[PDB]
Symmetry: C5
Subunit: 260 residues, 5 copies
């Protein structure tokens, strides 16, 4: 695409639900109880235990009254926020007491907060803790992995082209691709890591690259992608479940001239 001038503005928005595994009709936003200590040679996680990347396609009207200069929608900025962070102030429901006569144990531990906005589906690279993991039906995971899949195996290239299918533990945004997508992620690992989450409607991320060009909706589609694993919920029984929250996107779009 040869990018020309800006045509001299609309907003689109989405609340993207998290895909934590949802083990029954009442535990929407939670994973299945976590298993532990599986040998690498016999590691068969159940589908409902594995959080997956969330994604939605926002369709836009074509701008070309007549198909040398075309018009495409261009993403300029995004406002994004994790939705429901105060829900972790419920220490009365389900959580193990911190000590005798105490309140419930807060959600805490390993967390991952990630979003992307592009004119194409997110491009991902596969990396596994254990190349021998047997992944369950309904997941899409690195094909024909080897030991090299525990470091970098360039065979593992995927599109985030399906909601609730690509396990977060198997896939990362690919920095060698995503020419038409901007992505941002923080991983914080550990048993006792405190969740730290900020809300403000005053924060904007600018999506323009070094040349002042945002993601271009080449096929009149805008892609939003997220993963928001807030930490682990510890049941009275001792079992643990991932908890996730929805993510809001508001994307400012403008019309961009291009050659064709």
């Amino acid at each position: 695409v040869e990018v020309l001038e800006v045509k001299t503005i609309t907003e689109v928005e989405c609340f993207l639900n998290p895909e934590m595994g949802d083990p029954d009709e009442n535990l929407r936003g939670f994973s299945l109880k976590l298993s532990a200590e599986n040998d690498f040679s016999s590691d068969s996680p159940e589908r409902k235990m594995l959080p997956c990347y969330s994604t939605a396609r926002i369709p836009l009207p074509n701008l070309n009254e007549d198909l040398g200069n075309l018009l495409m929608w261009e993403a300029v900025t995004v406002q994004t926020e994790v939705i429901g962070i105060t829900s972790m102030l419920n220490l009365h429901a389900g959580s193990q007491k911190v000590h005798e006569h105490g309140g419930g144990k807060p959600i805490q531990g390993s967390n991952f907060h990630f979003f992307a906005v592009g004119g194409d589906p997110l491009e991902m690279q596969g990396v596994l803790m254990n190349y021998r993991t047997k992944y369950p039906d309904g997941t899409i995971t690195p094909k024909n992995p080897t030991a090299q899949s525990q470091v970098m195996n360039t065979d593992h290239k995927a599109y985030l082209d399906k909601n609730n299918a690509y396990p977060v533990e198997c896939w990362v945004p690919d920095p060698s691709r995503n020419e038409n997508t901007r992505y941002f992620g923080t991983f914080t690992g550990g048993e006792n890591v405190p969740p730290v989450l900020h809300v403000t409607n005053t924060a904007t991320t600018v999506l323009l690259d070094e040349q002042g060009v945002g993601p271009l909706c080449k096929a009149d589609s805008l892609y939003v992608s997220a993963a928001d694993i807030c930490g682990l919920f510890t049941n009275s029984s001792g079992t643990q479940q991932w908890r996730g929250l929805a993510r809001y996107f508001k994307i400012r779009l403008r019309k961009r001239s291009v050659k064709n």
Copy 2:
């Protein structure tokens, strides 16, 4: 409203201030600023918190000098939490950290939140457990389903009543609040240290990218807060939320609109 020039001249600027008291539950006439002791381990199917156990959002409407329906535009807010040094009382009520030790400081999950707008703060409901049975005198997501544990777009409310909207049920709605600025941080965990800053030299600019602050519909300014500071641990081991008041000083200017 189409937004035109800032009006300057005599009486084209005002400053209003307020202290918003916290609404932590106030379980008896002597424990203002605390919640009732926390229950733990309720099954999701049998979760009935008492009103006095549930911290709520604080909110107040500040009347502004009457303009002929020019609007008042909020430009800056100075805000801080009041009484942070009260947590240096380790002689009263708190469980000793060990034999012959001082009392356990307040610590654990905390939430620090404030909003300034020309409309009531617009909130979105999200629940830990959609089956929680909330008590009389609370306003909570109406007729929740399983999706209410993630995003259910039916749960929209105005923060239109003090000491009524539980903090655990509601967040500011980023899809609305065109005319409000809000700021919050949640830090969760049993051992989280409270970290609180005071200074009269720090100001938050409420102007958007176009240089426009909250516009005060009907000459009313809305302030909102939640300052849950952590958990107080009694000698028995029981725990109570502790909250503190928030101060607001808001500078406004007259703005022409069409």
Copy 3:
């Protein structure tokens, strides 16, 4: 009504303000008395030497009479932070054969500069606390004293009298003072303290006007509770350190 800056018109004053942690005996200057624990709210009578108090000094300036001294910048630093590397004196072993336990836990680092005494707001953990003789604490407190009670207005007008647990800088006043404080609470919080002679705080407000020394007096105020010292026995004491101030002042014309 503040006119022009006069351009021998720039003075410096410096001060080392000692902490007031309670000083339970003549050897334990800079420490509090052993902390008590688990007093019922209905019977909470803390001893004076257990309560750290705000430090303050009034620095008299030459009477220029109008012209007034205007405070423009402050350089400030907590003094003796390396003393906490002494883990051989008095502190409880971390484990068998281990060194002493570091000072750690709740801390409060605060300073103010103005041309009037620091204006303070009262707030209490427990309104029913019975405070000892020699302390100045909220008068006629109620349950609302545990949140915001506008009755509790004080001037920091006596050194070693206003307990830190009772009083905060009042953001509704202090027109003629700049104040800065950080509270970090918790059982095991690490003290984190920086020293540099390269850091300056500007005291000018939005209109370029610093505190104005009313009656030719400059006011410095501080509280530097570093955390808790844990004795061998398990008893705990607050530890505090002195604060340095170097303040640049200029002559300002006023109507």
Copy 4:
């Protein structure tokens, strides 16, 4: 490794992309990216770590296209490294708490990777220059490592004898070597060490972040003999097996380096 002519001619830009694999020890064919289980409590006098227990620096030399038709000319062209974008690849793999790791408590999930970590990269036109420092000068290092020669007690602080080039992949143990701030005129390096048993790994990914490699004079690393050097160490923490044994976990590092042609005086 991709070397791409993005733009040609006088204002030519070349982008070099590459994924540098970590060198954590790889104790068996299935545990690529992990070390051998850590030993503990070896007396200083009797400290003989096994090869596969010792994470090493990663490095590679990337040959660039020759720019000089005539080597006699008064001016010669050199590739100059202007910017780098870099991140650690596969950080979400640590959300697998079902494989191999000690349960946090009865009926709990696996223990996350955590503890001491080191994240480091360098981009230069010469091999990264390193200074040796040892915890224990009397350590006996295994065949296949390059470690400080004839160490003394002074090697536990600063011994200026211990100078090396990072000139071999999977050979220089991280615990023996640091980048040398007294040299590296033609390299830019960046590292953070975080020590402690329960240190949480904190890793950021974004394709929007760029590090500028220009010095105060506006000059990037100059690729001597058309050679670009990439170096990394990304020890993420310790993986704790159900037995309680611990292994270093490392991840690959991505580099995207932007280069332009600088004219230099022919020496």
Copy 5:
């Protein structure tokens, strides 16, 4: 100071106590629980400030303009196989952690220090320079305790801080982080410069053609398998850019 280049460099060794010929960079094992009335620490237990006078080429004086500095050998703490207590059964060695202090100064005169003591009654050992005639006021601010950092391996870190009321001709920077379980966090990069010019663009001036560097880099406590603890310190590198200034 009237009208307005050379670079000097130094690797300054730490002075942690060096309890024997093999344990260079470590202190003697720490004592605990001494009564304030009987606290007599051994010299080899006490980390001291490091310092070096750097002689410079002889109405013109050398003005220090910038410093690059970093702590040398931080990756050496990734040796968890040697001497340290296992974190649990079958586990690796315990990382160096706990109270740390990282400090450096650049000046045209020796660093000026102020004495402050945890315990004024401490009896300090021969070979140390500590506050003279300490009183209870030495636990807070006692203006008697003034010293020059004029001897390497003599002034215990626990007794002395940089004096903010002097040091007209020195720039200094320190962070103290206290606590049993504090993680060391150390950064390396050759891309970082500290500018030593004051608000009027004047750097430290080297009177007597001498440049003074000072450091303390106590990284944390090393826990032996026995449970005994020792300070670990590391060297600091300095590269200082000077220019000629007319006086």
